[PDB]
Structures are given as structure tokens and as C-alpha cells.
Design a protein around this motif. Structure first.
Motif, PDB file in Angstrom:
ATOM      1  N   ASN A  63       0.829  -1.197   0.000  1.00  0.00           N
ATOM      2  CA  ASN A  63       0.000   0.000   0.000  1.00  0.00           C
ATOM      3  C   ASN A  63       0.867   1.253   0.000  1.00  0.00           C
ATOM      4  O   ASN A  63       1.940   1.285   0.608  1.00  0.00           O
ATOM      5  CB  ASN A  63      -0.944   0.014   1.205  1.00  0.00           C
ATOM      6  CG  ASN A  63      -2.045   1.047   1.072  1.00  0.00           C
ATOM      7  OD1 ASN A  63      -1.822   2.156   0.586  1.00  0.00           O
ATOM      8  ND2 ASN A  63      -3.247   0.684   1.497  1.00  0.00           N
ATOM      9  N   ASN A  64       0.365   2.276  -0.689  1.00  0.00           N
ATOM     10  CA  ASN A  64       0.934   3.627  -0.740  1.00  0.00           C
ATOM     11  C   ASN A  64       2.460   3.615  -0.853  1.00  0.00           C
ATOM     12  O   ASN A  64       3.183   4.174  -0.028  1.00  0.00           O
ATOM     13  CB  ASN A  64       0.501   4.432   0.485  1.00  0.00           C
ATOM     14  CG  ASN A  64      -0.893   5.009   0.350  1.00  0.00           C
ATOM     15  OD1 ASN A  64      -1.615   4.721  -0.603  1.00  0.00           O
ATOM     16  ND2 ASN A  64      -1.270   5.846   1.307  1.00  0.00           N
ATOM     17  N   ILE A  67       3.468   8.072  -2.763  1.00  0.00           N
ATOM     18  CA  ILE A  67       2.563   9.225  -2.781  1.00  0.00           C
ATOM     19  C   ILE A  67       3.411  10.485  -2.926  1.00  0.00           C
ATOM     20  O   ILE A  67       3.882  11.061  -1.943  1.00  0.00           O
ATOM     21  CB  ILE A  67       1.668   9.279  -1.543  1.00  0.00           C
ATOM     22  CG1 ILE A  67       1.269   7.875  -1.068  1.00  0.00           C
ATOM     23  CG2 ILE A  67       0.454  10.164  -1.813  1.00  0.00           C
ATOM     24  CD1 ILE A  67       0.736   6.979  -2.162  1.00  0.00           C
TER      25      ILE A  67
ATOM     26  N   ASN B  64      -2.401   1.419  -4.465  1.00  0.00           N
ATOM     27  CA  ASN B  64      -1.846   2.777  -4.510  1.00  0.00           C
ATOM     28  C   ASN B  64      -0.320   2.781  -4.626  1.00  0.00           C
ATOM     29  O   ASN B  64       0.398   3.341  -3.798  1.00  0.00           O
ATOM     30  CB  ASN B  64      -2.285   3.571  -3.279  1.00  0.00           C
ATOM     31  CG  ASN B  64      -3.684   4.135  -3.409  1.00  0.00           C
ATOM     32  OD1 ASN B  64      -4.405   3.845  -4.362  1.00  0.00           O
ATOM     33  ND2 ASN B  64      -4.068   4.964  -2.448  1.00  0.00           N
TER      34      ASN B  64
ATOM     35  N   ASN C  63       3.627  -0.213   3.890  1.00  0.00           N
ATOM     36  CA  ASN C  63       2.808   0.991   3.877  1.00  0.00           C
ATOM     37  C   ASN C  63       3.685   2.236   3.866  1.00  0.00           C
ATOM     38  O   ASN C  63       4.758   2.265   4.476  1.00  0.00           O
ATOM     39  CB  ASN C  63       1.862   1.024   5.080  1.00  0.00           C
ATOM     40  CG  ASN C  63       0.771   2.065   4.937  1.00  0.00           C
ATOM     41  OD1 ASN C  63       1.004   3.168   4.442  1.00  0.00           O
ATOM     42  ND2 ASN C  63      -0.434   1.716   5.363  1.00  0.00           N
ATOM     43  N   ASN C  64       3.193   3.257   3.167  1.00  0.00           N
ATOM     44  CA  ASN C  64       3.773   4.604   3.104  1.00  0.00           C
ATOM     45  C   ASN C  64       5.300   4.578   2.992  1.00  0.00           C
ATOM     46  O   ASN C  64       6.025   5.138   3.813  1.00  0.00           O
ATOM     47  CB  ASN C  64       3.346   5.423   4.321  1.00  0.00           C
ATOM     48  CG  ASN C  64       1.957   6.010   4.180  1.00  0.00           C
ATOM     49  OD1 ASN C  64       1.233   5.718   3.229  1.00  0.00           O
ATOM     50  ND2 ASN C  64       1.585   6.859   5.127  1.00  0.00           N
TER      51      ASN C  64
HETATM   52  C1  LIG Z   1      -2.561   6.479   1.303  1.00  0.00           C
HETATM   53  O1  LIG Z   1      -2.426   7.876   1.019  1.00  0.00           O
HETATM   54  C2  LIG Z   1      -3.674   8.575   0.918  1.00  0.00           C
HETATM   55  C3  LIG Z   1      -3.349   9.996   0.526  1.00  0.00           C
HETATM   56  O2  LIG Z   1      -3.835  10.924   1.487  1.00  0.00           O
HETATM   57  C4  LIG Z   1      -4.431   8.476   2.239  1.00  0.00           C
HETATM   58  O3  LIG Z   1      -5.699   9.109   2.102  1.00  0.00           O
HETATM   59  C5  LIG Z   1      -4.617   7.016   2.629  1.00  0.00           C
HETATM   60  O4  LIG Z   1      -5.213   6.929   3.917  1.00  0.00           O
HETATM   61  C6  LIG Z   1      -3.274   6.294   2.641  1.00  0.00           C
HETATM   62  N1  LIG Z   1      -3.456   4.883   2.942  1.00  0.00           N
HETATM   63  C7  LIG Z   1      -3.239   4.361   4.154  1.00  0.00           C
HETATM   64  C8  LIG Z   1      -3.479   2.886   4.286  1.00  0.00           C
HETATM   65  O5  LIG Z   1      -2.868   5.046   5.101  1.00  0.00           O
END
Ligand SMILES: *[C@@H]1O[C@H](CO)[C@@H](O)[C@H](O)[C@H]1NC(C)=O
Ligand SMILES: *[C@@H]1O[C@H](CO)[C@@H](O)[C@H](O)[C@H]1NC(C)=O
Ligand SMILES: *[C@@H]1O[C@H](CO)[C@@H](O)[C@H](O)[C@H]1NC(C)=O
Ligand SMILES: *[C@@H]1O[C@H](CO)[C@@H](O)[C@H](O)[C@H]1NC(C)=O
Ligand SMILES: *[C@@H]1O[C@H](CO)[C@@H](O)[C@H](O)[C@H]1NC(C)=O
Ligand SMILES: *[C@@H]1O[C@H](CO)[C@@H](O)[C@H](O)[C@H]1NC(C)=O
Ligand SMILES: *[C@@H]1O[C@H](CO)[C@@H](O)[C@H](O)[C@H]1NC(C)=O
Ligand SMILES: *[C@@H]1O[C@H](CO)[C@@H](O)[C@H](O)[C@H]1NC(C)=O
Ligand SMILES: *[C@@H]1O[C@H](CO)[C@@H](O)[C@H](O)[C@H]1NC(C)=O
Ligand SMILES: *[C@@H]1O[C@H](CO)[C@@H](O)[C@H](O)[C@H]1NC(C)=O
Ligand SMILES: *[C@@H]1O[C@H](CO)[C@@H](O)[C@H](O)[C@H]1NC(C)=O
Ligand SMILES: *[C@@H]1O[C@H](CO)[C@@H](O)[C@H](O)[C@H]1NC(C)=O
Lengths: 135, 135, 135
Positions: A63-64, A67, B64, C63-64
Motif C-alpha cells: 500500500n501507498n 505518494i 496505490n 505501507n507509506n
Molecule cells: C494512502 O495515502 C492517501 C493519501 O492521502 C491516504 O488518504 C490514505 O489513507 C493512505 N493509505 C493508508 C493505508 O494510510
């Protein structure tokens, strides 16, 4: 960038700038010249190998990863009221280059929001000559 | 970029700028010249190999991977009221280049929001000459 | 960048700047010249090998990994009221270059918000000549 030149009035390899009153005579001025130039530049041999998330073999919920953003630029905001509230110009000009209240803008942008970019960019920008050459 | 030149009035390899009163005679001015130029530039041999998520062999829920954005630019915002509220110009001109309240804009953009971009870009930009050459 | 030159009025390899009153004669001025230039520059042999999250073999919830942003620039904010509130210019000019209340802007940007970028960039920027050369 080998010759980023800014010669003021003039350039010349072999010049004779003779420009006031000069009786000159019987000159031999032999000129053997070998001006070889070699340019062998910018030989890129690159292997980028740019890759995301090659092998999730098993069960990895990802995930992500990337970004970028959010973001703003808002670069040019003059916001110049200039409420003079009594202008009496009375502006007599003679042979004058005259810029009044002009907004010269040259916004050159390139390669924006591009994930990847190989090779090369190049932004040259000349500017105005504006030679009155009045009497 | 080998010669980004800005010669002021003039360029010349071999010039004779003789421009005031000069009795000159019996000159031999022999000129052997070998001006070879070689340009062997920008030989790209690249292997990008740009790749997302090569092998999810098993059961990996992905999400994402690449969120670019959101974003704004809002580059050029003059916002120039200029409420003079009494203009009496009375503007007598003689042989003057005169720019009044002009907005010269040259917005050159390229390669925007492109995922990938190989090879090369090039943005040249000349500017105005504007030679009055009045009496 | 080998020659980032700023010659003031003029450049020349072999010049004779003879410009006031000079009786000159019977000169031999033999000139053997071998001006070879070699340029062998910017030979990139690079192997970037740029990679995220190569092998999540098992079950790793990621994540992130890369949160760039959020961000603003807001670069150019003049915000110049200039409320003179009594202007009596009475401006007599003779052969004067005259810039009044002009906003010369040259905003050159490139390679913005790009994840990766190989090779090379180049931003040259000349500026105005603006030669009145009045009487
Ligand atoms: C991924 O990034 C988006 C961008 O703001 C955010 O809204 C979303 O919560 C994020 N995903 C997680 C799992 O934190
Ligand atoms: C130039 O050459 C001629 C011929 O050799 C010679 O007579 C003359 O005197 C030379 N010039 C001057 C000013 O002496
Ligand atoms: C002129 O220069 C070239 C290059 O160095 C040379 O080969 C040639 O012999 C020269 N000739 C004379 C007459 O000097
Ligand atoms: C470019 O790189 C490859 C990879 O090692 C090599 O085989 C090749 O000889 C190189 N060529 C040059 C001109 O550097
Ligand atoms: C130019 O050459 C002629 C012929 O050789 C010579 O007579 C003359 O004197 C030379 N010029 C001058 C001003 O002497
Ligand atoms: C002129 O220059 C070339 C190149 O160097 C040379 O081969 C030739 O011999 C030269 N000739 C003379 C008369 O100098
Ligand atoms: C380009 O790269 C390939 C890969 O190694 C190589 O086989 C080839 O000889 C190279 N060619 C040049 C002109 O560099
Ligand atoms: C992915 O990004 C979008 C962009 O805002 C967001 O709305 C969404 O919630 C994100 N997904 C997760 C699972 O967070
Ligand atoms: C220039 O050369 C000529 C010929 O050799 C010579 O007679 C003359 O005297 C020389 N010039 C002067 C000013 O003497
Ligand atoms: C001129 O210079 C070249 C290069 O050094 C040389 O080969 C040649 O012999 C020279 N000629 C003379 C006449 O000096
Ligand atoms: C470039 O690098 C590769 C990898 O080691 C090598 O095989 C090749 O000979 C190099 N070429 C040059 C011109 O440096
Ligand atoms: C990832 O970054 C976004 C950006 O604000 C944030 O909203 C989100 O909560 C982050 N995820 C976690 C698990 O903290």
C-alpha cells in the motif's frame, strides 16, 4: 557547455581592427593556421534498471508505495495595485528607449511531473537587443 | 551546447574591420587556414529497463503504488488594478522606442505530466530586435 | 563548462587592434599557428540500479514507503501597492535609455517533480543588449 560566450561588440579568430588614421604599408602578414577542433562529448552508456516491487512471491498486501503530492506552485503573483490617484504625466521625450509599466515575463518550463526522464534537456534563452542608434 | 554565442554587433572568423581614414597599400596577407571542426556528441546507448510490479507470483493484494497528485500551478497572476483616477498624459514623443503598459509574455512549456520520456528536449527562445535607427 | 566567457567589447585569437594615428610599415608578421583543441568530456558509464521493495517473499504488509509532500512554493509575490497619491511627473528626457516601473521577470524552471532523471540538464540565459548609441 564548452563556449557559453558573451562577446561585447564583436568576436573574430584573426582580426585586424584598424579604425583610426594610420598610414600602413608593405606588410607581409603570412598566416599559417591549423585550427582543428574535436568534440567527443556526452557519450551516455547507461543501464538505468529502474523498478518497483519486483517479486512479491507470497502474500504481501502492499500500500501507498509512492505518494507524491499534494502540492501547489503559485509562482508569479504580482499583486501590484499602483493607485496613483493623481497622474499628471507631462512627459516630453527625445530619442530615448523608454519602457513604462511593462511586465516582461519569459516563463520557460519543461519536464514537469514526469515519473522518469532519460537523455537530456536544454533551455537556452536569448534576450532583447533593443538598439535605438539615434542621431 | 558548444557555442551558445551572444556576439554584440558582429562575428567573423577572419575579418578586416578597417573603418576610418587609413591609406593602406602593398600588403600580402597570405592566409593558409585549415579550420576542421568535428562533432561526435550525444551518443546515447541506454537500456532503461523501467518496470512496475514485475512478478506478484502468489496472492499479494497491491494498492496505490504511484499516486502522483493532486496539484495546482497557478503560475501567472498579475492582479494589477492600476486605478490612476486622474490621468492627464500630455505625452509628446520624439523618435523614441516606447513601450507603455505592455505585457510581453512568452510561456514555453513542454514534456508535462509524461510518465516516461526518453531522448531529449530542446527549448530555444530568441528575443526581439527592435532597432529604431532614427535620424 | 570549459569557456563560460564574458568578454567585454571583443575577443580574438590573433588581433591587431591598431586604432589611432600610427605610420607603420615594412613588417613581416610571420605566424605559424597550430591551435588544436580536443574535447572528450562527459562520458557517463553509469549503472543506476534504482529499485524499491525488491523481494517481499513472505507476508509483509508494507505501507507509506515514500510520502513526498505536501508542499507549496509561492515563489514570486511582489505585493507592491505604490499609492503615490499625487503624481506630477513633468519628465523631460534626452537620449536616455529609461526603464520606469517595469517588471523584468525570467522564470526558467525544469525537471520538477520527476521521480528519476538520468543524463543531464542545461539552462543557459542571455540578457538584454540595449545599446542606445545616441549622438
Ligand atoms: C494512502 O495515502 C492517501 C493519501 O492521502 C491516504 O488518504 C490514505 O489513507 C493512505 N493509505 C493508508 C493505508 O494510510
Ligand atoms: C614601401 O615599399 C616601397 C617599395 O619597396 C618603398 O619604396 C617604400 O619606401 C615603402 N614605404 C615607405 C613609406 O617607405
Ligand atoms: C603549415 O602548417 C601545417 C600544419 O602544422 C604544416 O603541415 C605545414 O607544413 C605548414 N606550412 C608552412 C609553409 O609553414
Ligand atoms: C557500454 O557498456 C557495456 C556494458 O558493460 C559494454 O559492454 C560496452 O563496451 C560499453 N560501451 C562503451 C562505448 O562504453
Ligand atoms: C607601394 O608599392 C610601389 C611598388 O613597389 C612602391 O613604389 C610604393 O612606394 C609603395 N607605396 C608607398 C606609399 O611607398
Ligand atoms: C596549408 O596548410 C595545409 C594544412 O596544414 C598544409 O597541408 C599545406 O601544405 C599548407 N600549404 C602552404 C603553402 O603552407
Ligand atoms: C552499446 O551497449 C551494448 C550493451 O553492452 C554494447 O554491446 C554495444 O557495443 C554498445 N555500443 C556502443 C556504440 O557503445
Ligand atoms: C489511495 O489513494 C486515494 C487518493 O486520495 C485515497 O482516496 C485512497 O483511500 C487510497 N487507498 C487506500 C487503501 O488508502
Ligand atoms: C620601408 O622599406 C623601404 C624599402 O626597403 C625603405 O626604403 C623605407 O625606408 C622603409 N620605410 C622607412 C620609413 O624607412
Ligand atoms: C609550422 O608548425 C607546424 C606545427 O608545429 C610544423 O609541423 C611546421 O614544420 C611549422 N612550419 C614552419 C615553417 O615553421
Ligand atoms: C563501462 O562499464 C562496464 C562495466 O564494468 C565496462 O565493462 C566497460 O568497459 C566500461 N566502458 C567504458 C568506456 O568505461
Ligand atoms: C500515510 O500517509 C498519509 C499522508 O498523510 C496519512 O494520511 C496516512 O495516515 C499514512 N498511513 C499510515 C498507516 O499512517
Amino acid at each position: 557547455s564548452i563556449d557559453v560566450k558573451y562577446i561585447g561588440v564583436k568576436s573574430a579568430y584573426v582580426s585586424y581592427d584598424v579604425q583610426k588614421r594610420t598610414i600602413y604599408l608593405n606588410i607581409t602578414n603570412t598566416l599559417n593556421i591549423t585550427n582543428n577542433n574535436y568534440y567527443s562529448v556526452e557519450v551516455e552508456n547507461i543501464t538505468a534498471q529502474v523498478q518497483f516491487s519486483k517479486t512479491v512471491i507470497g502474500k504481501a498486501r502492499l500500500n501507498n508505495i509512492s505518494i507524491i503530492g499534494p502540492l501547489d506552485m503559485k509562482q508569479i503573483d504580482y499583486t501590484v495595485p499602483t493607485v496613483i490617484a493623481e497622474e499628471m504625466s507631462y512627459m516630453y521625450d527625445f530619442c530615448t528607449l523608454i519602457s513604462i509599466k511593462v511586465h516582461n515575463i519569459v516563463l520557460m518550463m519543461q519536464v514537469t511531473v514526469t515519473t522518469t526522464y532519460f537523455g537530456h534537456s536544454e533551455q537556452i534563452s536569448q534576450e532583447r537587443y533593443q538598439y535605438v542608434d539615434c542621431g
